[PDB]
Subunit: 75 residues, 6 copies
């Protein structure tokens, strides 16, 4: 016969104390951006992004993270 | 017979105290950016990004992390 | 017969104390950037990035990390 | 006795032919101008000019000039 | 006795031929102007000009000028 | 007795030929201008100019000039 028991236990803790979080400034692209193009030939797909794109300001009050995974394997 | 028992335990602490978090400045691309293009030929796909793109300011008030993983394996 | 038992225990601590975290300045690309191109021929795929791209300012208030993994294996 | 006679004669010419005059561009102050002031004390008169001021474009189709002056003087 | 004669003669000419005059562009202050002021103390007269002021575009079709002066003096 | 006579004659010519006058570009202050001032004390008169001021584009189609003066003097 074959018998398998899988009962792991977690009592661990992820935590943080912050008195105050703030005064955050993100100013992407505050300068002059200039793009001059003449007589350009494109013979396939073109993807273009100009200016201030995809910029992120992420300020979670805690932002703590726990990743837990189990991958029982048998033959 | 085959018998397998799996019961590991975690009780650990991941922690920080922060009295204040702040006064953070990110200013990507505050200068002049100038692109001048003439008589260019492109014969396959073009991806172009100009200016201040994909910049991140990430300021989690704790930002502490636990990873735990289990990969019990048998033959 | 075959018998396997796995029951380890963890009670560790990862910690740090911060009075204040701050006054952080990141100014990538604050200067003049200039790109002049003439008569260029491209016969395959082109990826172009100009200016201030992908810059990161990461300021976790704690930023402590615990990595734990278990890979019990048998033959 | 005293006798004085003043009879100069003038037949001069100041002239130009212009086939066309044009395609003139004046773009003063096309860039970013930024002034930040804090905690300043002024105890006498202030004159302040900020931006694009007093700029001239002057395009007279001939613009030719004659100055002539006569100053007969005696003792 | 005293005798004075003042009879100067002028047949001189200031003239110009222009086929066409035009296509003149004056764009003062086309960029961003920013003025931030805090806690300023002024204890006398203040004169302030901000933006695009006193700019001139002068395009006379001829604009030719003749200045003539006479200043007979005796003692 | 005293006798004075002044009768000079002038027939001079100042001239120029222009096929076309044009394609003139003046772009003063096209770049970024920044002025940060803190805690300044002024105890006398202040004159301030910031940006693109007093710029001149002068394009006379002929622009020829003759200055003539006569100053008969006696003792």
């Amino acid at each position: 016969s074959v018998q398998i028991v899988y009962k792991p236990v977690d009592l661990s803790k992820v935590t943080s104390k912050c008195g105050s979080l703030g005064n955050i400034h993100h100013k992407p692209g505050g300068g002059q951006v200039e793009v001059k193009s003449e007589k350009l030939d494109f013979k396939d797909r073109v993807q273009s992004k100009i200016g201030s794109l995809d910029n992120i300001t992420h300020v979670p009050g805690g932002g703590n993270k726990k990743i837990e995974t189990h991958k029982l394997t048998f033959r």
